[model samples]
Target: DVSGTVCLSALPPEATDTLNLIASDGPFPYSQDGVVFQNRESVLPTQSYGYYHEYTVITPGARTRGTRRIITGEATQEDYYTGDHYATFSLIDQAC
Candidate 1:
């Protein structure tokens, strides 16, 4: 089956760690972890500057920054996930 949204708690440990780190400042694995998200694809909501911040999700054996990413909305700490270089996206709804 296909899914458009994902369960927040169902995310992988790597992503969960990133989510947990969402609550506070973090010593992320990379310098780009907390960079501003421009939403190049315009896939997310139509928010202006500084609304989104992206964090990395470790990969499986890639040993580098992989395709997966966690995009967070700073407004309410809402999160989104992209498992394939943003080819697809899903809102991480906690109640899912």
Candidate 2:
């Protein structure tokens, strides 16, 4: 029987505490500044940064307490410019 504490585990595996820092929420509310992709909330103008953008997920009830991970990666696409990238990150409650 699954008793004691059933640890689900973090997403990335590296962070084990923080999520990925995507685009800022503001400084680009109307998708005019940047941060194109829709986050977990599926809402533009994210709730993390604002302009630069950031990836923040909303879990049911207190975001749950457990181990999380935050991994960082770069990009190499021409269309997306030099800074453009995949912007991938592991999911955790909501903090690092």
Candidate 3:
């Protein structure tokens, strides 16, 4: 497992359009790796701080359904400062 500051890095102006920050409401509960998937919101109110959110990715394994949901969201709108788009999930090597 890797431990460090996981940052989005930078989000392009068009990111809001091209990307969809899948929340708990959207299609979710998928399986991947050993974790759910999700992501931060793609858009937000102007001048508002960002929030934490999640995204969905896929892993390989018996339980792995080829997809999962992850949580994301920043503290404020400014916190949305990262190009890091989607997250990837994968099961343990043995599961694969």
Candidate 4:
């Protein structure tokens, strides 16, 4: 089962959209949104290959891909959010 008790309403609009897309096995807006996230920074919990995937969080008017992102795990439906491009993460409550 998934963990955490974060309320979806508290998250940004972009994050909520991304989360919904993940649930739908998205036709993502960005081609890179569904790529494997190689937790190279060792910030998130350790996992094997294909355990995690990443999605982009639109940063409004930014010309390039911004720092925000949503990372989800395949096994538990575990989700996490990072506004700083992987410098940190907070588990997204499946309850939401």
Candidate 5:
């Protein structure tokens, strides 16, 4: 229900870190890294990824499950970058 934006340049550098992690797909530090997002949580939109995955952004403030997240998916209109939990996920064309 949104076009999640925030250019790669505008996003925090740590977001870059998580993006790359998705590329790796297996060596993540967090248990919820790649294969566990389905139904475990519903913060992001609806899915199957259309084959999607969610990775939490770094919360340097308190060592927690930070509110920021990058939701990766398969189509041009797929991914949704969310901020501050529970509000909602915004779909960015990801045109960056």
Candidate 6:
């Protein structure tokens, strides 16, 4: 049910770093970085409860983790990014 791909280089430096962190089993800065994303918005393709996971996309100069985030699915390979705090999303394409 996933769709599309976005070049890894096209994303912000922080975003790219986050992807790398996901791959490496991170020492993430946020406690909620690897939590399950409920996907109540239904913006992403449907899957089991634990099938999808989320990670914070550090926003420059903000009091908290900020809205931007990356949502990864399945084996943590298929990923989606929401820059507007889940108002919208773009699939992260590593094959670029």
- Could you say which candidate leads in lDDT? 6
RMSD of each: 2.8, 15.8, 13.0, 3.2, 3.4, 2.0
Please report the TM-score between candidate 3 and the true structure. 0.24
**Residue pairs with backbone atoms closer than 3 Å in model 4 (clashes):** none
lDDT of 5 by residue, 15-90 (tens): 6777777767757667776653463365555666346766876766757677877777765545556676535666
List candidate 5 segments past 4 Å from native. 36-50, 92-95
Better of 5 and 6 by lDDT: 6
| Better candidate by lDDT, 1 or 2 | 1
lDDT score for residue 51 of model 5 = 65
Tens digit of per-residue lDDT, candidate 4, span 1-96: 223445666778888899889889988988999899999766777789778899999899988779999988776767888878888788876565
Q: Is candidate 2 or candidate 3 better by TM-score?
A: 3
lDDT of each: 0.80, 0.25, 0.30, 0.81, 0.63, 0.84
Off by over 4 Å in 4: 1-5, 94-96
Which lDDT tens digits does candidate 1 get at residues 1-96? 114778877777688888877666787888889999998778887788889898988887987898999988876747888888766678887775
Order of the predicted models by lDDT, top scorer first: 6, 4, 1, 5, 3, 2
Q: In terms of TM-score, which candidate is strongest?
A: 6
Writing each residue's lDDT as its tens digit, candidate 6 over 40-85 gives 8687877789888899989889789899899988864688887788
Q: What lDDT tens digits, residue by residue, belong to model 2 across residues 1-90?
A: 111211224233322222222333233212322333334442222334332222222222534322221112222210111111223332
Worst 10 residues of 3 by lDDT: 87-96
Q: What are the runs in model 6 whose C-alpha is more than 4 Å off?
A: 1-4
Ranking by TM-score: 6, 4, 1, 5, 3, 2
